[model samples]
Target: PLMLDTAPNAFDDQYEGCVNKMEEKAPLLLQEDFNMNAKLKVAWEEAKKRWNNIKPSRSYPKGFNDFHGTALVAYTGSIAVDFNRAVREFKENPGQFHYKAFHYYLTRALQLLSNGDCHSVYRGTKTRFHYTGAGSVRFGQFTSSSLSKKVAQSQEFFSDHGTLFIIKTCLGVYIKEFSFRPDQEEVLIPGYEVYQKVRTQGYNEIFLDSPKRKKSNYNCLYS
Candidate 1:
């Protein structure tokens, strides 16, 4: 039997330590010389509020990490948004300390801390989360255009890394693993090309499109 309480104590020692370390790293962006201007500082504060307001009671699953990339903004070396990276870039181009990038990272961190799981709630789009109760699934079903749409959306926020697609087929709901790497030059069944979400609505409707994804791109599985 599956329980929504998979990680009732998600905010255990490990999670607490991670959040604490990340919070500590947040303030480095405020150094005077680094100068995040005024708005970004306020934005950072907003992110802080969001982080602090996150309640374990919300049933935040264990494990938390952020993976949003804003290259269009970084201009130089990624999002010049990170504190350490921004500072390093600033020493060279003064203007590379993108305030928006800083704000974006803060927002990403805030969301990650709140969700804490690799479920769709944590991913941006593309990936969907479902709880299938029974029925056998296949690999070709995931190639549908409908599935591709959500995957496309998931990538907008760079919601990869812990990307997941869970389903329940003939037994219990489980996370079906799959991976799609662009610039690979090789073709393998041709997926959405963009990222997508796991469909929680249909349950086992679209399960694993590839078994190889099981060997890679998988997060901890729970009942």
Candidate 2:
């Protein structure tokens, strides 16, 4: 038996797979059956409005009023938060026509924003993650994290006591990057590798084996 040095390209491939599925299942949704349904149609339109009307904020410096790549990244972060009605509705549904279509919309938005850069980000979650010390660990959905190490350490975004993930993204990872908020947050489509355990003020429990995905399951864009 052998273990590779790292699960290098596992997540990059996952990102591509999600994108391919979105292309196959919901491509050109605005002009297709996605808009035909009343609820989804409203959801789509409201999503667009929110995407375009993002107010300038701590994270989103330029806001959607300016069409810069940074503004797009900020918009991505806004819905990744998904606090409002339409956005929350998308999350609540999580179906092919509902959540996945929103995911597809986001994928397209990110594609136009980033120039394909590899970088590191951080995620602070209440979920306990355990590694088997074999095979690989993969984040198999669209996820949010902070570009600022300090933000992740502060553990304000998710919870006071949570596990921190040190994630490295490859060029194939579609990431919408931004900074400015206390969180200094960004969002990325599913991509993999180089995540280590807890890094915050309090001690977080870590166990070998039985890695867990997030309980909320917001990360699963395809579901």
Candidate 3:
């Protein structure tokens, strides 16, 4: 009887109780390992807050700033289009991913709202997104351990994720797409891991160290 609003931010706790169970399970489908989902939720909440507060002055993109952040999300984002069908599928094939996909959609949709150029599809022709879960989770690395071959690649461009690599060249760099291959011995963590998982799994950390600098003779990227 205490039903609350399902408004994007309405269910505002980032790491919900749900995540704990998912982490415990760690199955491909349990799908609750990362905190990025929470970040996306919070971001949408922020977008909601922004939608409520900010008034655009410069080039206000059409179909953006429509009712309750929907326009920003739907403008070339296709969120509205996708969700209608996705929810229908959920009715028949309700899985945890269906619930999680909503968050992933909001996250990417919100990103699209800002990027503006990510309207059609991103990365490349070969890098088509299958669905929300596959699209987002293709998140990646192994080999060149050099010191351990555990160290991986870049986050900004040719960015490698678990198994999906995104090519940002269409907008910024020239890399097409990358793939993530899991290494058995060395799935290194941050602080090597004092940091959080949601905060993690970023290539940004790999940048911090010279895993194979080798007195600057050998390039880390090559090592």
Candidate 4:
């Protein structure tokens, strides 16, 4: 009973406004200087250490060659895991402005890396809670998805009664270099629009189409 065309506009007014505001602020922060406190410095160092260990280092976006880009990558990865906790840590220490600034930098970097192209991404989850055909998803949170359908259907997220979300959006980070497996093609989106939802019965499922854009299209980064 799922029709991709029939879902109401998944992008609400607030989400659009949030993107607009970030679009305006991200570049400005990227141009400004970053002041790191001892606490934040430790956090960034930890993130950098973990990220530096990812194999096949060539998978990292070229923008991440710089300190700012690398730091933002770690922050984005943290946000995908626990956004609220990430915010709280910054709030209790160096203040949330640093958090917001990192996000701004990350957003701008993702925008630049993908050359502002919208992508079709997949997120799979298994939950007992019910969902309306079309409903509001959490905002201001970095969510994880995959560019590979095989990855989404893999044991990492596969479930017999799971839901697979197909999203189309321009706001995301290609963080495969930060992951254990480069082929996972992990993308972290802070804002997105769900294009459709597919119910899963079991593994190795069939799909209507592949991702709209090739993974290389998103690898283009600013110089």
| Number of the top TM-score candidate | 4
Error of 3 at 204 (Å): 17
> Model 4, which residues run further than 4 Å from truth?
1-43, 50-67, 75-79, 84-98, 128-139, 178-180, 192-223
Off by over 4 Å in 3: 1-45, 53-57, 68-92, 95-161, 164-223
Q: Each prediction's Cα RMSD?
A: 16.4, 9.5, 20.7, 9.1
- Candidate 1 C-alpha lDDT tens digits along 1-223: 1211112211111122244453455346434323745544454444444334333223332433222222111211222234434432333554554442343233333334332122211212233333333332222111211123344335443243323433211211111111122221111111111122223324313333212121111111100
Ranking by lDDT: 4, 2, 1, 3
lDDT string for model 4 (22-133, tens) is 5456445544323533454455566667656653345444544444445545653433344334532432443333444455455445555565665667766563223333
Q: What is the lDDT of residue 170 in candidate 3?
A: 14
> Which regions of candidate 1 deviate over 4 angstroms?
1-26, 31-34, 58-95, 98-223
TM-scores of the candidates are 0.25, 0.48, 0.22, 0.51
lDDT for model 4 comes to 0.47
Instruction: Give candidate 1's error at residue 50 in angstroms.
Output: 3.1
lDDT of 3 by residue, 37-76 (tens): 4443443444444445434523343433333243232212
Q: Give the least accurate 10-residue stretch of model 3, judged by summed lDDT.
A: 188-197
